[PDB]
Design a protein around this nucleic acid. Structure first.
Ligand SMILES: [Mg+2]
Ligand SMILES: [Mg+2]
Length: 757
DNA sequence: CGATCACGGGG
DNA sequence: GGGTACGTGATCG
């Protein structure tokens, strides 16, 4: 029709699938239904006569037998070669996992294809439907909750004590205790507060619900408490409840007819932070501080009734900034959805590797190219163990560091050298390009599937950039700016995608060859930098860090900016080097393990910081102190003295026991564990005392002095008696503090043995 | 040793 | 739900 597609799914009616297309048409919510789309897979047979045995294969599901409804002989392309496969139709999507292995096992079946694409995604591709097209303006609502938590409680034990929401009308708090603030609505109970949230959402009818970690906290918690209280959450536009989907080891929540936009996975990919707390995230984007009110402060205020205004202000600000961040990060996710042709819900929760794959599956359909299969476990494992043919960084502390980015070099290399799995070492090829050093041959006789698509993306970006220069409308310009950035992101992900172990179009030789050709330009950049007095401190496939030893910082910045402008004038086509940034100081340990500090004093690290609950505070605190001594004080000698003093204090039992607590979650019933770690040993004793130990409960423990593995010497933090129990100083030194700092201090020539008296 | 198991965000 | 992360490091067995 005319509207913007925001999502798609399927429902089953009288055992048959119905596709639903969720649309927004000039401000109105619309649902279109399609009963005609049929599930299918492909089968390559040894011979056409075999179809008579294959079409008769059956399976079982929902107490009924599953059959192939129709078969169709089709002509397609596989690896740039014509192929004849049989399209096997099935009645219901759930018939595909039930029958696919019974077809694959058949002696007449060479292989099966396209048997794991979800029905709603299969529909959008086959029908040529693209989400988020048009100038349709969506409505947004941020949602958040505060709860009553005590250390180690089962998930959902304590009530929800506040629910906050925010949009352009302001930020509001719903609570069931008397708090006298203008934005606070006081209700009678937890039940009445949850029913008020339901009413707000049904009345405001937002297209987008913005949360911060709503997938794994706010919505699973609301669902747990609504279950306990025996109330429904009809938040879906079809009155359905929020739906929890197991996405990996964690969860993802969907709200039918809407976009549940969880900012946590989105921001985690976009920017680099040691910890992605809402307060750290808000400050990195808006340059303003946000106060954190910790779980224990919240519990204390609720139970004593004192200082509840502070907790209500915290709840309000949580919703307020969640709204602000949502508006900031949504436009780019909307353009990426449009580009890849899949809904924002899915696109915002996926890696760039999956964004590339979704883009390629759609283009394969458009081009009548059969998609290769995802690897089996053994192949995936064989791919992770593959070695690539074709430096370690400078030691010590460096000053005035410029960062240069190479990533925009690789799409142009893929295109000019026709680097694709369908062009690699092709038989009876008339002309080919040979990769330097690795010698892989890529046929020049026809454009490769992936170079062809990249060429079109880069051309489309150049058109957008030209239309941007010629536009007087700042609205169109803002939108076109997002569109051209989406292409840059997608195009710059192909190099990585070639080496991604889960990729359908995985190609080790393609990745290797792009690296080998890329290196010729990197070596040119390095020689040209050194001829200009620059010293290269660190270099990898993504970029480099350099300085002019002992030069004035403004001179380094000017010379680097002049260098980038010069080299890009020398580089042919769309090969581009970028000036990324400047740092006051920094040091480099190894590949993607380094730490820097900018001119505003913000520490920036990669592959070193250990901010996680399963590491003791003493190890995390010492590591922070070491990085601060090095980057803020330019003093490695102070850092070594900090480690030496901490280790002596641990040996003389001068460290508070509270800085020694280790936290680990129970993730299954205790009887299901194959290996009993210290937290499981502690948990089993707690359950033996009558504690209801459940998956989700976090176990706090201290390692005590003694013989054997740490499993037999861990004690529950609640059972620790400082007057009776002695902590293991050698464990906290050798397994906690020293591993936290040894990688960092290796960059300065220190070994683990030199960090003690 | 290989196998197993945990982390993040949120209260 | 025709795709159940992601990559990495500690500890058990
Ligand atoms: Mg969906
Ligand atoms: Mg909150």
């Amino acid at each position: 029709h005319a509207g913007m597609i925001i999502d798609a799914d399927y429902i089953t009616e009288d055992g048959k699938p119905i596709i639903r297309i969720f649309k927004k048409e000039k401000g109105e919510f619309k649902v279109e239904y399609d009963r005609t789309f049929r599930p299918y897979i492909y089968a390559l047979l040894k011979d056409d006569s075999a179809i008579d045995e294959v079409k008769k294969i059956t399976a079982e599901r929902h107490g009924k037998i599953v059959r192939i409804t129709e078969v169709e002989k089709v002509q397609k392309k596989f690896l740039g070669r014509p192929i004849e496969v049989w399209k096997l139709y099935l009645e219901h999507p759930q018939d595909v996992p039930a029958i696919r292995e019974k077809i694959r096992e058949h002696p007449a079946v060479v292989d099966i294809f396209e048997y794991d694409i979800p029905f709603a995604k299969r529909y959008l591709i086959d029908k040529g439907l693209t989400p988020m097209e048009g100038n349709e303006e969506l409505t947004f609502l941020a949602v958040d909750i505060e709860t009553l938590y005590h250390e180690g409680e089962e998930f959902g034990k304590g009530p929800i004590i506040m629910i906050s929401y925010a949009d352009e009308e302001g930020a509001k708090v719903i609570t069931w205790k008397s708090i006298d603030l203008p934005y606070v609505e006081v209700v009678s109970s937890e039940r009445e507060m949850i029913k008020r949230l339901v009413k707000v959402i049904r009345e405001k009818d937002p297209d987008v619900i913005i949360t911060y970690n709503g997938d794994n906290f706010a919505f699973p918690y609301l669902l747990k408490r609504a279950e306990k209280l025996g109330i429904k959450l009809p938040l879906g536009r079809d009155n359905s409840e929020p739906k929890m989907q197991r996405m990996g080891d964690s969860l993802a929540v969907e709200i039918k007819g809407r976009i549940h936009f969880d900012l946590f996975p989105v921001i985690r990919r976009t920017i680099n932070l040691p910890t992605y707390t809402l307060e750290a995230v808000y400050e990195a984007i808006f340059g303003k501080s946000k106060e954190k009110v910790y779980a224990h402060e919240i519990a204390e205020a609720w139970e004593t009734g004192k200082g509840l205004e502070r907790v209500a202000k915290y709840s309000m600000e949580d919703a307020k900034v969640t709204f602000e961040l949502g508006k900031e990060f949504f436009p780019m996710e909307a353009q990426l959805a449009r580009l890849v042709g899949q809904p924002v819900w899915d696109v915002s929760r996926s890696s760039t590797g999956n964004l590339v794959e979704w883009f390629l599956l759609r283009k394969a359909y458009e081009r009548n190219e059969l998609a290769p299969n995802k690897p089996d476990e053994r192949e995936y494992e064989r791919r992770l163990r593959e070695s690539y043919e074709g430096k370690e960084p400078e030691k010590g502390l460096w000053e005035g560091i410029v960062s240069l980015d190479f990533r925009s070099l690789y799409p142009s290399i893929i295109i000019t050298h026709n680097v694709s799995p369908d062009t690699l070492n092709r038989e009876n090829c008339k002309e080919y390009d040979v990769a330097p050093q690795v010698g892989h041959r890529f046929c020049k006789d026809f454009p490769g599937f992936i170079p062809s698509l990249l060429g079109n993306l880069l051309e489309e970006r150049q058109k957008i950039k030209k239309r941007m220069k010629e536009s007087k409308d700042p609205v169109e310009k803002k939108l076109l700016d997002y569109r051209q950035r989406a292409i840059k992101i997608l195009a710059n992900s192909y190099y990585g995608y070639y080496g991604y172990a889960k990729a359908r179009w995985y190609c080790k030789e393609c990745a290797e060859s792009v690296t080998a050709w890329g290196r010729q330009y990197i070596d040119l950049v390095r020689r040209e930098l050194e001829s200009r007095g620059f010293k290269v401190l660190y270099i990898d496939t993504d970029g480099l860090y350099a300085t002019i030893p002992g030069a004035k910082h403004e001179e380094i910045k000017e010379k680097a900016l002049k260098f980038v402008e010069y080299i890009n004038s020398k580089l042919p086509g769309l090969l581009e080097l970028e000036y990324e940034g400047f740092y006051a100081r920094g040091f480099f340990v190894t590949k993607k393990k380094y730490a820097l500090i900018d001119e505003e004093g913000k520490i920036v690290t990669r592959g070193l910081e250990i901010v996680r609950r399963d590491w003791s505070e003493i190890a995390k605190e010492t590591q922070a102190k070491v990085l601060e001594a090095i980057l803020k004080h330019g003093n490695v000698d102070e850092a070594v003295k900090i480690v030496k003093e901490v280790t002596e204090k641990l040996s003389k039992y001068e460290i508070p026991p509270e800085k020694l607590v280790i936290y680990e979650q129970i993730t299954r019933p205790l009887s299901e564990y194959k290996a009993i770690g210290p937290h499981v040993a502690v948990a089993k004793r707690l359950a033996a005392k009558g504690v209801k130990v459940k998956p989700g409960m976090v176990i706090g423990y201290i390692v005590l002095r003694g013989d054997g593995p740490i499993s037999k010497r861990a004690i529950a933090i609640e059972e620790f008696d400082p007057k009776k129990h002695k902590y293991d100083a050698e464990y906290y030194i050798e397994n906690q503090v020293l591993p936290a700092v040894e990688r960092i201090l290796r960059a300065f020539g220190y070994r683990k043995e030199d960090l003690k008296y």
